[PDB]
Design a protein around this nucleic acid. Structure first.
Ligand code: HPA
Ligand code: HPA
Lengths: 338, 338
DNA sequence: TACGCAAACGTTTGCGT
DNA sequence: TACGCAAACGTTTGCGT
């Protein structure tokens, strides 16, 4: 069909291609005629043919974990903006943490010959790390590791530990000493990482978290709901709670309400993520904000680089969480004594 | 590189291709050898070359409006599941209701030669309807119209009007007669449509909504926040409020709380969407549930059809909203008098 | 029986002159 | 000066025998 254009215009397809890609000078008259044809014939140049020759699809693949989750969703929307503005096409894939699913999308991606790969898999077992390597040839950056798990990738690091520390510190500085924590999956960075940053500040303050006070979450609201319940549903209960993620926090808020508990008047709650609509939680959620937009743009850029300026070496860029005071925390019994 | 495989195996590329696509019988010995090579050589068949010949990319394009929004997000995650399970690849595009952006993604999509198009643009001006037609050749279904705006597409219809009616009815049947409403954009179906279904039930009950009681939203939480405020911030206020979408409702809940109003004890609130985590709103949100999963699977199917069984005629399938009682509504002053 | 030769898909780009 | 011819990208598939 580029042939059909060339002939309506009575010029070579070489000509047609040059005017289309402005790749060499062409007589106006000529140029015009081509456009003419191009339009009446209703021509849509085929990218598949082009990619076949030029060797790049100008398309990028995001191998995510899930895209419904608030947290994830915001990131993804970020990456897409960046692809759109630099002409890239985004292929979205959710692996639900399923190896098989992961092996599958990864392969459905290489064949489609994506220019680069964006990896956000939450948990990284050696078997997954292993698969990942089999595609070192395809440029890629993992956007969710704590440290640099591997050498065949680029990495953007969130400083999830420094975030945990911040959260704890805040609680301490507000007068709290009986604190509880609902962490996210330990196999994940935003999980383990945040928790440990938190425990460190405790250790520092000689606070001790009684194990009956720490309950595993899964980032889902129901997990939060169940944990808070289990926490407040006991003889002795903390006065403040650190919840590993906002959406779980949202769940924690609902249960308290349901036990007729008052936030922050009966329990103080601090979360983590600062998801777009946490300010509209009831009450407005105090939390640690994760730079989602930057986490995305930053990732897109390292990739474009490697893609364009053919980098070979592994890079890593840090990003920084920051505390956001809203209205879900209140002074604790020791506020006056410091 | 299929050539490199054929030679490590000392067979024709024709052979290689046949064993790869199991498209004709091949000697085990032969088959094996090919696999052998296939593996040592680390071969990834190129889809771009294949599509070039077979004439289909086995990839579908979703021209959405935005993907962060809860509502949208859930739908999208649904479509992707369906693509994944039937071997399709999903290209996600957000046009933010921007014509230019829409013209762009639409074109960046045809060229990439997607097998079919999934359209979810919220608002459809003639200029957009017009662009859409220019691609009638590419199979596509719009998943968000009220009626069948055009004839060159397939349509899944949500019965957003019947939903509005349901909401109103409920309020009426609970004793309410002083009701207010925060609708979504009138230029959109889930906006106009829901509102009108609602007004009809009012008209039926001879209830009259004083214009000081209806405030436009935009589906975003802040819009909700502002509207509720404007509503309760007045001499005379309704006892129940119908909010066009859950996330806006979430916003409406926060403001009431902030004016020290009690839900549902001071104001009753009913929303619409039944977004995955509305049950964890405080209080648990009573709402109209939109079948998001079905809305998605249903759309994917009409498309696959047209794509596969080469349909030519426009189809339309209806889907149905249903009421979900949670805890944000309470009996009104007229409950006892019916 | 089990497999090859060679043309074709729709482009881009090197040399020409 | 301003433009064409023809090979190549990596496959699939019709006929062969
Ligand atoms: O894995 C996660 N899921 C949801 N929210 C999150 N916030 C941090 N990590 C996550
Ligand atoms: O356009 C919309 N946006 C967000 N939520 C919605 N629920 C119905 N329509 C919409």
């Amino acid at each position: 069909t580029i042939k059909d254009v060339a002939k309506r215009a009575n010029v070579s397809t070489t000509t047609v291609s040059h005017v289309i890609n402005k790749t060499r000078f062409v007589a106006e008259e000529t140029r015009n005629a081509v456009w003419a044809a191009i339009k009446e014939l209703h021509y849509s140049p085929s990218a598949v043919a082009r990619s076949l020759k030029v060797n790049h699809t100008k398309s990028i693949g995001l191998l995510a974990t899930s895209s419904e989750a608030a947290y994830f969703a915001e990131i993804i929307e970020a990456v897409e903006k960046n692809c759109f503005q630099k002409g890239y096409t985004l292929i979205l894939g959710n692996a639900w943490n399923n190896l098989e699913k992961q092996r599958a999308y990864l392969s459905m991606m290489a064949q489609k010959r994506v220019d680069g790969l964006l990896v956000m898999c939450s948990e990284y077992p050696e078997p997954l790390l292993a698969m990942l390597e089999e595609y070192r040839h395809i440029p890629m950056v993992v956007m969710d590791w704590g440290e640099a798990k591997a050498d065949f990738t680029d990495a953007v690091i969130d400083n999830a530990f420094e975030g945990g520390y911040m959260a704890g510190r805040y609680l301490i500085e507000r007068g709290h000493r009986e604190i509880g924590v609902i962490p996210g999956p330990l196999e994940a960075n935003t999980g383990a990482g945040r928790l440990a940053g938190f425990m460190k500040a405790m250790e520092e303050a000689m606070i001790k978290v009684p194990e009956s006070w720490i309950v595993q979450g899964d980032f889902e609201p129901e997990s939060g709901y169940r944990a808070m319940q289990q926490i407040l549903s006991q003889p002795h209960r903390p006065t403040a709670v650190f919840c590993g993620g906002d959406i779980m926090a949202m769940g924690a808020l609902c249960a308290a309400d349901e036990m007729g508990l008052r936030v922050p008047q009966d329990v103080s709650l601090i979360g983590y993520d600062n998801v777009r609509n946490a300010r509209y939680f009831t009450p407005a959620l105090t939390t640690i904000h994760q730079p989602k937009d930057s986490l995305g743009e930053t990732a897109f850029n390292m990739l474009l680089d490697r893609i364009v300026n053919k980098r070979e070496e592994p890079q890593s860029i840090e990003v920084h969480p920051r505390l956001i005071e809203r209205r879900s925390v209140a002074d604790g019994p020791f506020r006056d004594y410091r």
